[model samples]
Target: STLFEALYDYEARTEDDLSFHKGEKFQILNSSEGDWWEVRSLTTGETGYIPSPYLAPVD
Candidate 1:
């Protein structure tokens, strides 16, 4: 499951160009690891086990 990474911080759960609306673009804190991260879905309040690529910056 090792592909590639750049800088290694966080990721965003966007449609990945496909368009999955339920998949909101969230952020994962303390992700110095670079592959796995956690995010809280505001609309559902459901904690998600997503990859680091499923998050974005709050800024």
Candidate 2:
């Protein structure tokens, strides 16, 4: 089991070298009170931080 899953997609706005597309999925790892979240990409299996606003909840 995973901690959590992404409900929506996101495109990185920063130059953190993160690559993502619409409907992309990720494994939720950790989160903070800030605007960023620590997640693991399901497609690429890479760990990185992404903006929290870009993520949406599942239906």
Candidate 3:
């Protein structure tokens, strides 16, 4: 899985969305979902969609 980190805080607007704080880490599950990429939160073990722009690939 590809590792990523949040660039800013994101609040879930829908039940299928994932809310995360700035600097939170996530594992990319599906990037083919267009702008909303499916990811699993490393901190909470929750999986949902998050805006692609809000995340940056971990170094």
lDDT of each: 0.42, 0.66, 0.86
Between candidates 2 and 3, name the one with more favorable TM-score. Answer: 3
- TM-score of every candidate: 0.40, 0.65, 0.89
Report the CA-based lDDT of candidate 2 relative to the real structure: 0.66
Query: Residue 8, candidate 1: how far off, in angstroms?
Result: 18
Error of 3 at 5 (Å): 0.5
Q: Write the per-residue lDDT of candidate 2 for residues 1-59, one digit (tens) a residue.
A: 33433445566666663567767766777765577777888889877788767666544
Model 2 residue 23 CA deviation (Å) reads 0.4
Best by TM-score: 3
Give per-residue CA lDDT, model 1, range 1-55, as digits (tens). 2222223433444542122243355434335655755445454465655565533
Best by lDDT: 3
Candidate 2 lDDT trough over 10 residues, lowest sum: 1-10
Pairs that collide in candidate 3 are none
What is the Cα-based lDDT of residue 46 in candidate 3?
A: 82
Candidate 1 local lDDT, residue 33: 59
